[PDB]
From a paper:
To overcome Env metastability and create stable, homogeneous Env trimers for structural studies, uncleaved prefusion-optimized (UFO) design was applied to these two Env sequences, generating X18 UFO (CRF01_AE Env) and X16 UFO (CRF07_BC Env). We complexed X18 UFO and X16 UFO with bNAb 8ANC195 to further stabilize the Env trimers in prefusion state and determined their cryo-EM structures at 3.0 Å and 3.5 Å, respectively. The overall structures of X18 UFO and X16 UFO adopt closed trimeric conformation in prefusion state, and closely resemble the Env structures of representative strains BG505 (subtype A), JRFL (subtype B), 16055 (subtype C) and X1193.c1 (subtype G). Consistent with their closed prefusion conformations, the FPs in X18 UFO and X16 UFO are both ‘exposed’, akin to the FP conformation in native prefusion Env trimers (compared to JRFL WT). We also compared the interfaces between 8ANC195 and X18 UFO (CRF01_AE), X16 UFO (CRF07_BC) or BG505 Env (subtype A), and found that amino acid (AA) variations of interface residues among the three Envs do not affect the binding of 8ANC195 much. There are 29~30 potential N-linked glycosylation sites (PNGS) in each protomer of X18 or X16, we observed 18-20 of them in the cryo-EM structures and confirmed the existence of other PNGS, most of which locate in or near the structurally invisible variable loops, through mass spectrometry analysis. Together, the structure and MS analysis identified 30 of the 30 PNGS in each protomer of X18 Env and 24 of the 29 PNGS in X16 Env. Moreover, the V1s of X18 (CRF01_AE) and X16 (CRF07_BC) are significantly longer than those of strains BG505 (subtype A), JRFL (subtype B) and 16055 (subtype C). In contrast, wild type X16, which bears an E at residue 500, does not bind F6 at all. R500 on Env forms salt bridges with D30 and E53 from F6. Hence, the change of R500 to E500 would lead to electrostatic repulsion among E500, D30 and E53, thereby explaining the failure of X16 to bind F6.
Residue numbers in the entry:
A (entry chain X): 33 to 57, 66 to 135, 152 to 309, 312 to 320, 320A, 321 to 354, 356 to 394, 412 to 504
B (entry chain Y): 268 to 309, 312 to 317
C (entry chain Y): 129 to 135, 152 to 171
D (entry chain Z): 81 to 128
E (entry chain D): 0 to 129
F (entry chain V), G (entry chain W), H (entry chain U): 520 to 547, 554 to 557, 565 to 660
I (entry chain E): 0 to 106
Write the structure that this text describes.
Amino acid sequence: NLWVTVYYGVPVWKEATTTLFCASDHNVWATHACVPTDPNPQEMVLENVTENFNMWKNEMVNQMHEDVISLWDQSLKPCVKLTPLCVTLDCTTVNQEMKNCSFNTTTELRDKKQKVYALFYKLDIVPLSNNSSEYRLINCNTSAITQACPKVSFDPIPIHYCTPAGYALLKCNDKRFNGTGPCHNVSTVQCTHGIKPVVSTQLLLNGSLAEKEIIVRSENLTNNVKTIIVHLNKSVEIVCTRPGNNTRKSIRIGPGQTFYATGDIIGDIRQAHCNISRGDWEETLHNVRKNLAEHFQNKTIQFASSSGGDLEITTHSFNCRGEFFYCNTSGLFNSTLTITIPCRIKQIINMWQEVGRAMYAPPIAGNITCKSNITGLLLVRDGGKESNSTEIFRPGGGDMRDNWRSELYKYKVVEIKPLGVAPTECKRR
Amino acid sequence: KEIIVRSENLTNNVKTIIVHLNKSVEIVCTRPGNNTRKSIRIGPGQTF
Amino acid sequence: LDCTTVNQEMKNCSFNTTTELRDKKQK
Amino acid sequence: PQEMVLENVTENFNMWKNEMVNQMHEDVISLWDQSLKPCVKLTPLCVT
Amino acid sequence: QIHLVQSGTEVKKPGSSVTVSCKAYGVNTFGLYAVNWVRQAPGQSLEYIGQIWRWKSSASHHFRGRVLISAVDLTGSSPPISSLEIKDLTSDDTAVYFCTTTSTYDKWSGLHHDGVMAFSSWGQGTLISV
Amino acid sequence: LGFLGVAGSTMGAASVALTVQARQLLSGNPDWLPDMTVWGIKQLQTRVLAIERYLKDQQLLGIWGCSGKLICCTAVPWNSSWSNKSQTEIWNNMTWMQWDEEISNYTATIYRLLEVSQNQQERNEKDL
Amino acid sequence: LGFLGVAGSTMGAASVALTVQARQLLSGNPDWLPDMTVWGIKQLQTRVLAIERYLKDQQLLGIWGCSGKLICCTAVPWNSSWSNKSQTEIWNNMTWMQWDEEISNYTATIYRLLEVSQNQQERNEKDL
Amino acid sequence: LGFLGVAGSTMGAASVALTVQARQLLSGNPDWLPDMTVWGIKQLQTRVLAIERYLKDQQLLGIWGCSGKLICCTAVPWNSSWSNKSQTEIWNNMTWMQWDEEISNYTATIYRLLEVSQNQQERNEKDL
Amino acid sequence: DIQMTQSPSTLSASIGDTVRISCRASQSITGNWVAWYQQRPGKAPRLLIYRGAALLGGVPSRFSGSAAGTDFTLTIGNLQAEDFGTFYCQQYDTYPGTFGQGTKVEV
Ligand SMILES: *[C@@H]1O[C@H](CO)[C@@H](O[C@@H]2O[C@H](CO)[C@@H](O[C@@H]3O[C@H](CO[C@H]4O[C@H](CO[C@H]5O[C@H](CO)[C@@H](O)[C@H](O)[C@@H]5O[C@H]5O[C@H](CO)[C@@H](O)[C@H](O)[C@@H]5O)[C@@H](O)[C@H](O[C@H]5O[C@H](CO)[C@@H](O)[C@H](O)[C@@H]5O)[C@@H]4O)[C@@H](O)[C@H](O[C@H]4O[C@H](CO)[C@@H](O)[C@H](O)[C@@H]4O[C@H]4O[C@H](CO)[C@@H](O)[C@H](O)[C@@H]4O[C@H]4O[C@H](CO)[C@@H](O)[C@H](O)[C@@H]4O)[C@@H]3O)[C@H](O)[C@H]2NC(C)=O)[C@H](O)[C@H]1NC(C)=O
Ligand SMILES: *[C@@H]1O[C@H](CO)[C@@H](O[C@@H]2O[C@H](CO)[C@@H](O[C@@H]3O[C@H](CO[C@H]4O[C@H](CO)[C@@H](O)[C@H](O)[C@@H]4O)[C@@H](O)[C@H](O[C@H]4O[C@H](CO)[C@@H](O)[C@H](O)[C@@H]4O)[C@@H]3O)[C@H](O)[C@H]2NC(C)=O)[C@H](O)[C@H]1NC(C)=O
Ligand SMILES: *[C@@H]1O[C@H](CO)[C@@H](O[C@@H]2O[C@H](CO)[C@@H](O[C@@H]3O[C@H](CO)[C@@H](O)[C@H](O[C@H]4O[C@H](CO)[C@@H](O)[C@H](O)[C@@H]4O)[C@@H]3O)[C@H](O)[C@H]2NC(C)=O)[C@H](O)[C@H]1NC(C)=O
Ligand SMILES: *[C@@H]1O[C@H](CO)[C@@H](O[C@@H]2O[C@H](CO)[C@@H](O[C@@H]3O[C@H](CO)[C@@H](O)[C@H](O[C@H]4O[C@H](CO)[C@@H](O)[C@H](O)[C@@H]4O)[C@@H]3O)[C@H](O)[C@H]2NC(C)=O)[C@H](O)[C@H]1NC(C)=O
Ligand SMILES: *[C@@H]1O[C@H](CO)[C@@H](O[C@@H]2O[C@H](CO)[C@@H](O[C@@H]3O[C@H](CO)[C@@H](O)[C@H](O)[C@@H]3O)[C@H](O)[C@H]2NC(C)=O)[C@H](O)[C@H]1NC(C)=O
Ligand SMILES: *[C@@H]1O[C@H](CO)[C@@H](O[C@@H]2O[C@H](CO)[C@@H](O[C@@H]3O[C@H](CO)[C@@H](O)[C@H](O)[C@@H]3O)[C@H](O)[C@H]2NC(C)=O)[C@H](O)[C@H]1NC(C)=O
Ligand SMILES: *[C@@H]1O[C@H](CO)[C@@H](O[C@@H]2O[C@H](CO)[C@@H](O)[C@H](O)[C@H]2NC(C)=O)[C@H](O)[C@H]1NC(C)=O
Ligand SMILES: *[C@@H]1O[C@H](CO)[C@@H](O[C@@H]2O[C@H](CO)[C@@H](O)[C@H](O)[C@H]2NC(C)=O)[C@H](O)[C@H]1NC(C)=O
Ligand SMILES: *[C@@H]1O[C@H](CO)[C@@H](O[C@@H]2O[C@H](CO)[C@@H](O)[C@H](O)[C@H]2NC(C)=O)[C@H](O)[C@H]1NC(C)=O
Ligand SMILES: *[C@@H]1O[C@H](CO)[C@@H](O[C@@H]2O[C@H](CO)[C@@H](O)[C@H](O)[C@H]2NC(C)=O)[C@H](O)[C@H]1NC(C)=O
Ligand SMILES: *[C@@H]1O[C@H](CO)[C@@H](O[C@@H]2O[C@H](CO)[C@@H](O)[C@H](O)[C@H]2NC(C)=O)[C@H](O)[C@H]1NC(C)=O
Ligand SMILES: *[C@@H]1O[C@H](CO)[C@@H](O[C@@H]2O[C@H](CO)[C@@H](O)[C@H](O)[C@H]2NC(C)=O)[C@H](O)[C@H]1NC(C)=O
Ligand SMILES: *[C@@H]1O[C@H](CO)[C@@H](O)[C@H](O)[C@H]1NC(C)=O
Ligand SMILES: *[C@@H]1O[C@H](CO)[C@@H](O)[C@H](O)[C@H]1NC(C)=O
Ligand SMILES: *[C@@H]1O[C@H](CO)[C@@H](O)[C@H](O)[C@H]1NC(C)=O
Ligand SMILES: *[C@@H]1O[C@H](CO)[C@@H](O)[C@H](O)[C@H]1NC(C)=O
Ligand SMILES: *[C@@H]1O[C@H](CO)[C@@H](O)[C@H](O)[C@H]1NC(C)=O
Ligand SMILES: *[C@@H]1O[C@H](CO)[C@@H](O)[C@H](O)[C@H]1NC(C)=O
Ligand SMILES: *[C@@H]1O[C@H](CO)[C@@H](O)[C@H](O)[C@H]1NC(C)=O
Ligand SMILES: *[C@@H]1O[C@H](CO)[C@@H](O)[C@H](O)[C@H]1NC(C)=O
């Protein structure tokens, strides 16, 4: 009558987690840490299938964060260390954003010392005593400084995460997807689109734009501590620079280990600053405000500057040609032809929020200028029922993973079970 | 069951004899003091 | 190590060593 | 070892674009480096 | 972690409409989490009033055209909400109504089928008399 | 069609073009990684695990007598207690996902039966 | 005889000794390299790649109606738009290398036709 | 009965449960040691070696026409020179280990005869 | 529609005893697809077992379920300390679902 029949190739999938690799179309990503390849990609559109998605527990972002940290560490380790720099620095006025400091170091011969001098930003300097003229670097008691490695480039490049054999990626193509819920238009792929691992705070930069209109997403809107990601459809133009003409000196601190520092500054004292197109910014603030009014009832929405705190979390942060800019955005998010914001810069950068590791970025010789697109915002709701009329939002940083969720929220990883059994009229074998 | 005696060559006199017991014996022991853990900054984050 | 009595199985030893600043010493 | 003689074939050789030599070269330097790394380093001899 | 707060007891003269509210504390959204309304009268027979699932609302045959089930997603000042509305009430509708929420993300867990499902979380129920 | 193109199609349609799904299981990345990387070891782990899974599935197929058959036909009767639904209903108004979910409890035992059946057959093939 | 000793022989003579070539795609693997160096990773490199290639070839054979057979007669007619030579000329005055070179443009089409023919045969068998 | 449970059983009784022995050749541990350790390299080596050994055994079986079979009839005559014992004594009095002991010198010849026999059979398949 | 019937209607019990409640369906349920619930007087129902014989978390390990072709049996073994109230058998094979009449347990 009815007999069993086994089928190989049955299209059924489970939810699963795996080690996804990456691919790219000197630089750490391009020539290390995953393969260079980009053949004709295979994208297909499934029919009559609905798939559930929730971006707020997805192992893609954890894997990407771990890979980014590991790659940066592996890049930093195989070159110069800065243990002899942690000495007493005699600092004086430049003769206002820097200080001229002289200090004693070793040389090519261990029985001889040398006197050298360099310019240092005061954000990289800590005093030793109130009634004294002694100074040291920030991370000389809490970590060990490693110099950013001059021949390698810390420039983001597009990267594609790719699934191994026996796995697949499902992509939600539904317009205006907020990351949680069913998906009625699903596609299958093997490799994600171009993802640029850019690290920034308070302003998402160089990202893919929303398809139709602004998308607002958070893990829990009712909670206030959680970050709110805003994904715009119109990119904003932000171009900015350190214009001061610098010159870097090479200091021999040992047998072949050279330490580069700000040898001198020439020209007029000009401050590093960021320009943003003002009219586009006003338009995008209006669009974000009236879009976010939907999720928050009839209560009015106000924007205010970031609360006081550490420079890393309070100020917007980014990197340009290796120079680390901390910009005070106290006028961008101040609401209810060009807008200019101040930008300090820092050399001893202690990112990844770990301890015992810190990096020193040598200054580029000439001035630095670079242009980019603001493609998203990270906003934080202020807690407390101070008023029942207006709800005020602030710039917000927090976990670095939020910088990548906006690019990885369409994707799901699924395992394939190819073996099935079914009854059929076939008997003979 | 009971005590086991092992040796890869018992007639040799320079080879270890292993004795496996069937009843465990109780040994409890201690350093009964009060030593405070002094921390010294050896270098940049190194602590002794 | 400059060692003296405990003031019987230990000795009280003082020594010079490095510190956070490489150009300074501590006792 | 196994060696067999191909009777009726004719093969084109070019010794100047053979990857065998490059692979051997890379192995030689890598091996020498990993041999000289795990022991004494003459950092304090650089004196007057 | 997951709680369901329901409206208060309210007794009405027969011949009017009634609304009942269910408030889901801890539910991220009504995607991945289906809401099912059930009834329990004296006689201790649990029925099945209706559901909202995948933003589609449906009701059983005994109540088609009689009950409207609505839902509003997570907002800033209010967790997800669901609501029963009975247009007309007879003498036999006196009962305690229960709101239930069931996770629908796994797609392989045994707690749900494509349309009919068990009830993982239960509210405290609203008593209605006529 | 393409890989997993027939997910929404019913089982009758999915019976065609199983070869795309079968062939996708072994396609891989010809390139590899340079030395001294945990990334390389993770990649090696992943692909060795993939090979092991494929080999296990193929061996399980072979023990049942379907060494090189995608749609082979065994000789085990289908107990109605496993899943008692009409042939037309199963092959015309149901996807493979719903089917695999609805017979999840009875899968393991079914496998054992297949084993025994083939073994019996093999023994008879030497006793006849 | 040897591994490739029939390289210069015509295909008719070469068809008799395919076992040696088939066997050497897997044998010859030595013991392991104890050191965790670049060399060990490159060994693991090459041998996992070899396993993947062999499994791919075997799967290609098995999807076709040629599982477990070194020589296999399929049921796809030989389109004359492909190589059009007399059987005597093919099997007595031509080596395998020249034959593979001449028909290089039609290999993908031949493989696809073999795939669809075997799928049709399996469907017919299950339906008849 | 479980794995290696039929070691003491005679050859006749042991043939009933070869699947239990066969299946354990692939079962393993899917986890991994993620610490760049030499332990991870050694584990990955032993797993690749196991895969290679299994694949070699399957290839050797397939060369003899017994690809999808655990018990297979090969149709090559049994030379009385390599073993001359009564069928009852072989199948009801000797364990498999003693059997492999008493024909140790002759396994290579048996294997070569098997491969030549299938080569002849495959050639005749297209000859006639 | 699919109906069910539970048995026994009511049973006495005691501390440490093992009890069994069997619900039978009007149609054989291919999958397990049956759920077991508790309900104390004046409280809300609590899901005990789903998928025939799957045990949730927090619920004690003493509960067990057996799924035959048509008859489903809930085994509450080793009634410890506090006794229980009303037990319920529910099916979710076809739409709409249906609950059983219910059984009561007492000391
Ligand atoms: C992330 O992104 C996601 C998308 O990417 C996003 O998803 C979106 O979520 C929102 C949730 O906020 C969804 O919007 C809601 O949708 C709900 C579901 O609505 C469906 O069902 C109703 C009802 O349909 C039944 O009845 C009609 C009657 O004609 C029949 O026609 C139907 O067939 C059906 O009848 C069957 O079922 C009955 C049982 O229920 C049986 O009795 C019957 O016999 C049948 O079997 C439909 O009307 C809806 O259709 C509407 O839209 C289509 C679109 O084509 C129109 O054609 C159609 O005409 C309708 O307009 C839909 O199918 C809604 O319930 C919900 O509505 C509430 O909110 C809106 C907006 O604020 C209000 O205007 C509305 O009045 C509702 O508010 C009431 O309910 C709340 C509940 O708390 C109360 O608080 C509120 O005060 C108000 O209550 C008042 O009215 C009650 C009566 O209604 C009364 O009882 C009360 O007492 C009080 O007076 C809302 O629209 C949206 O669809 C999703 N988007 C999708 C799916 O694309 C997600 O949110 C994002 N996440 C986050 C965190 O942001
Ligand atoms: C968002 O995305 C934008 C993309 O445009 C990024 O901006 C680009 O950033 C890259 C890297 O910082 C810039 O590329 C660099 O430009 C330098 C200056 O170029 C001028 O000078 C050279 C001198 O020859 C001219 O040829 C050139 O035409 C320009 O006039 C180069 O000097 C850099 O060279 C690098 O590579 C060489 C390779 O040999 C090395 O030797 C160098 O040392 C150096 O490493 C490099 O080409 C690019 O110009 C930027 N574009 C724009 C439009 O500004 C943003 O940085 C990004 N934002 C964030 C936050 O990531
Ligand atoms: C998103 O963030 C919001 C907060 O902004 C968060 O809402 C909170 O959820 C918890 C969990 O349900 C709520 O705590 C409960 O609130 C109810 C309200 O009536 C109380 O009755 C509960 O107390 C009973 O239950 C407790 C055990 O759970 C007993 O210990 C207690 O004695 C009572 O019997 C319980 O306190 C909390 O009230 C809300 N807060 C707000 C402001 O709504 C929501 O859960 C977050 N979402 C996610 C998915 O995490
Ligand atoms: C365990 O340890 C014991 C020692 O406590 C050890 O016993 C020793 O074994 C050696 C084995 O060679 C004995 O040496 C032999 O003694 C005999 C006694 O007559 C001699 O005839 C032998 O001489 C011949 O062989 C020599 C080469 O070995 C020739 O040079 C010579 O010309 C003869 O041809 C030889 O000396 C030794 O006497 C004992 N000693 C004792 C105390 O028993 C025992 O072997 C160890 N067990 C194992 C398993 O190793
Ligand atoms: C940072 O401080 C150091 C130490 O004071 C400065 O180095 C010294 O700077 C002085 C003043 O510019 C130089 O003196 C000049 O020397 C020339 C030599 O021809 C002499 O003709 C001038 O009259 C004047 O005295 C001195 O040479 C220089 N020494 C060294 C070793 O650099 C340094 O300039 C300061 N940096 C900045 C940016 O101000
Ligand atoms: C039919 O198949 C389903 C699916 O396997 C069976 O449900 C399974 O039941 C077991 C035993 O109750 C569950 O194991 C338990 O898991 C929980 C998870 O928290 C754990 O805490 C317990 O200690 C126990 O290990 C298993 O999870 C559950 N499966 C799923 C997917 O939830 C069901 O029992 C089967 N019906 C039969 C055999 O009649
Ligand atoms: C469902 O999603 C697919 C995939 O994004 C859509 O198909 C694409 O549509 C865009 C324009 O809308 C084309 O440029 C692409 O070439 C299409 N790709 C494929 C594979 O078809 C499709 O339009 C969506 N359909 C609906 C109803 O939303
Ligand atoms: C980006 O998205 C915004 C948000 O919708 C778009 O703004 C809309 O512009 C149209 C113009 O006809 C108005 O009718 C809508 O009311 C606007 N929507 C909102 C929410 O304000 C904007 O047009 C989009 N820009 C691009 C380039 O796609
Ligand atoms: C950023 O914008 C500022 C403001 O327009 C530019 O600075 C001006 O430059 C012009 C000539 O270059 C001067 O006449 C003005 O006095 C400057 N104003 C200020 C406030 O500095 C600056 O050049 C812009 N920078 C970039 C990189 O675009
Ligand atoms: C960023 O800059 C703004 C102004 O450019 C700072 O705000 C000023 O704060 C001081 C006190 O520290 C007040 O006296 C001023 O009135 C503020 N300015 C205005 C326009 O109101 C802000 O403190 C800066 N933040 C950081 C982190 O540097
Ligand atoms: C452990 O093993 C010893 C043997 O060494 C046991 O002691 C024996 O006890 C029996 C009692 O029937 C006596 O006849 C023997 O003379 C004892 N042997 C010795 C050497 O004294 C002892 O009872 C065992 N203990 C346990 C807990 O198993
Ligand atoms: C080990 O045993 C000794 C001997 O009993 C213990 O030392 C005695 O402790 C008691 C009080 O606890 C004193 O009154 C005696 O004077 C101690 N005698 C000696 C010789 O020390 C000791 O406390 C035990 N230690 C442990 C860890 O069990
Ligand atoms: C910035 O946006 C413009 C507008 O489309 C685009 O042409 C340009 O490529 C973008 N640049 C980056 C770095 O994303
Ligand atoms: C906004 O900017 C104006 C002028 O730039 C300033 O007067 C005002 O204090 C600012 N408000 C906030 C909240 O920063
Ligand atoms: C430095 O400034 C000059 C003008 O002051 C400008 O032309 C040049 O582009 C700047 N340098 C860089 C690297 O952009
Ligand atoms: C050891 O010293 C600490 C120091 O605060 C004290 O609290 C503790 O009681 C001492 N222990 C003994 C056993 O004296
Ligand atoms: C999807 O379903 C519709 C009707 O249910 C059918 O016509 C269509 O062929 C289906 N698509 C696929 C890919 O099976
Ligand atoms: C090589 O070619 C000659 C030509 O006559 C032929 O006799 C000989 O058998 C060939 N060798 C092989 C190995 O086929
Ligand atoms: C193939 O060759 C034969 C000669 O045997 C010839 O008759 C026929 O026309 C050829 N076909 C084509 C398509 O050239
Ligand atoms: C062991 O040998 C005895 C013969 O005395 C036999 O009866 C028994 O069945 C054997 N056991 C197994 C497991 O083969």
